[PDB]
Structure 1
Amino acid sequence: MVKVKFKYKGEEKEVDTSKIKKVWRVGKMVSFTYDDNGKTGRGAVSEKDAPKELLDMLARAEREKK
């Protein structure tokens, strides 16, 4: 169980990596979308605060050749 904790719209949050859908990099920012009980949530963390699991997922997304 790996939970990513982040702030969005001032709201503190925590999402389970298995709920994370897309992950991408924007500079040093790791951004993603996730299943938020029915809707698509958005969140991002600094690469430094990203657990290895999230970086693992980012590396996998970065290898996508479609």
Structure 2
Amino acid sequence: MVKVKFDATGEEKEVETSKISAVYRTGKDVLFSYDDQGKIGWGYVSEKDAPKELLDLLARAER
């Protein structure tokens, strides 16, 4: 369970951690790739709204 917000209408997709393609960082915030329908879909998530699973998969792929 990693949650992706849509502040336009305030919806919530839930992405399975295993399905994630790769995790990258923008300043504070975090920004990863899906595997939607073999389409390489995306998802930005705010520093404030970063869960641990995602910060972890990042700190790996980083340092």
The TM-score range, normalised by the shorter chain, is 0.7 to 0.9
Please give the residue correspondences for 1:1-66 in structure 2 after superposition, counting only pairs within 5 Å.
2-7=1-6, 10=8, 12=11, 13-63=13-63
Q: CA deviation at 1:17?
A: 1.4
- State the TM-score, normalized to the length of structure 1: 0.75
2:2–2:54: 8 Å Cα contact kept in structure 1?
no
Pick which of 51-60 and 11-20 moved more: 11-20
Aligned sequence identity (%): 64
Unaligned runs of 5+ in 2: none
Structure 1: which 5+ residue stretches go unaligned? Answer: none
Residues 23 and 33, structure 1, Cα contact 8 Å, conserved in 2? yes
Residues 1:19 and 1:6: Cα distance change in structure 2 (over 3 Å): farther
Shift of 1:61: 1.2
SS in 2 for 1:58: helix
1:15-64, CA deviations, whole angstroms, 9 ceiling, x for partnerless residues? 1111111111101110010110221111110122111001101111113x
RMSD value over aligned CA atoms?
1.9
May I ask how many residue pairs the two structures share in their alignment?
61
Letter in 2 for 1:52: K
> Which ranges of 4 or more aligned residues in structure 1 deviate by more than 6 Å?
none
